[PDB]
Amino acid sequence: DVHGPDPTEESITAPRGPFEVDEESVSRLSVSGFGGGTIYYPTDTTDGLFSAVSISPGFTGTQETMAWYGPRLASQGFVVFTIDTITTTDQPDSRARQLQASLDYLVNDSDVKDIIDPARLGVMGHSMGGGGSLKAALDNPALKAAIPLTPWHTTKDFSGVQTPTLIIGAQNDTVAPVSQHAKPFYESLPDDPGKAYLELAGASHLAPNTDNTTIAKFSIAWLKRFLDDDTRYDQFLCPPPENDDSISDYQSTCPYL
């Protein structure tokens, strides 16, 4: 199943896509292995199953720091789960296990299990949650997309990740400098099935925590392309964008074939 009309620059950069959305709060007390969260999902049941993505915050962060991704991404035809971790001080490998527990909940137990395609699952996360997204993909090669946002991890070698991975760095990140975190992660990844490194010009470590048209556009394109196998979105990814004031660097293994 693909979803929505043929995309444009306007459609992919808009605050909302064509799908109306609702939200379901998931109590910490009703789940195991993570801290609960918010499920954002399309209300249209006539368009086939949707792909699903779980989104982790970073160190000292809660789902509030990632809330804006919910409506923005789900309105493009995705089930989006902004999670809380067990404790805000959980480290990356723990965040990876909690991302996976959240996807297991969505597919096995959640009240949206019947509108998800359990074969089309992805992970995203901020900072230590971005390190968690890399580790979760390493441990679960069935995951069809990963988007680490200003990622942080002591582990540098993600050569084992077979999931299409878009790393978003912040040019001026003083917390997870791109020379020590995002770029090494990106360089370790295999060239197939597809990778990209998008560096946000002028951006701090906390750029991912507020509505960002560049983060939204490329995340939507990446999830469309790799969770839905929707090649209508290759046009935004490959060849890489050239004259985007918001992008200080872009590296890729385009084309994705």
Residue 182 in contact with residue 167, Cβ under 8 Å? yes
The residue ranges of every structural domain in the chain are: 1-256
Structural element, H or E, at residue 252: strand 247-252
Least Cα distance to 176 among 148, 214, 139 occurs for 148
DSSP state of 40: E
Rounded Cα distance between 167 and 63, Å, is 20
Rounded Cα distance between 173 and 160, Å, is 26
Rounded Cα distance between 164 and 223, Å, is 9
**Catalytic residue IDs:** 127, 173, 205
Q: Which residue has the tokens 């909690």?
A: 98
* Strands, sheet with 50-56, edge to edge from the N-terminal-most edge strand: 21-26, 37-42, 79-83, 50-56, 116-126, 145-149, 165-170, 195-200, 247-252
Least Cα distance to 210 among 69, 40, 95 occurs for 69
b/e code 101-128 from CB counts within 10 Å (16+ = b): bbbbbbeeebebeebbbeebbbbbbbbb
Least Cα distance to 128 among 88, 172, 75 occurs for 88
Q: Which two tokens stand for residue 23?
A: 């939200």
> What's the Cα-to-Cα distance from 105 to each of 30, 36, 180, rounded to whole Å?
10, 10, 33
3-state helix, strand, coil split of the chain in percent (to 5) is 30, 25, 45
Which of helix, strand or coil describes residue 167?
strand
Least Cα distance to 159 among 195, 192, 188 occurs for 188
Q: Which two tokens stand for residue 50?
A: 């949707």
Q: Which two tokens stand for residue 172?
A: 């001026």
Rounded Cα distance between 186 and 7, Å, is 27
Q: Which residue has the tokens 């394109």?
A: 221
Residue 81 in contact with residue 116, Cβ under 8 Å? no
Structural element, H or E, at residue 52: strand 50-56
Structural element, H or E, at residue 229: none
Say if residue 15 is preceded by a cis peptide, omega within 30 of 0: no
- Experimental method of this PDB entry: X-ray
Q: From the CB of residue 73, how many other CB atoms can be counted at a distance below 10 Å?
A: 24
Could you tell me which residues come within 8 angstroms of residue 113 by beta carbon, excluding any fewer than 6 positions away?
106, 107
Least Cα distance to 20 among 51, 49, 44, 50 occurs for 44
User: What type of residue sits at position 241?
Assistant: P
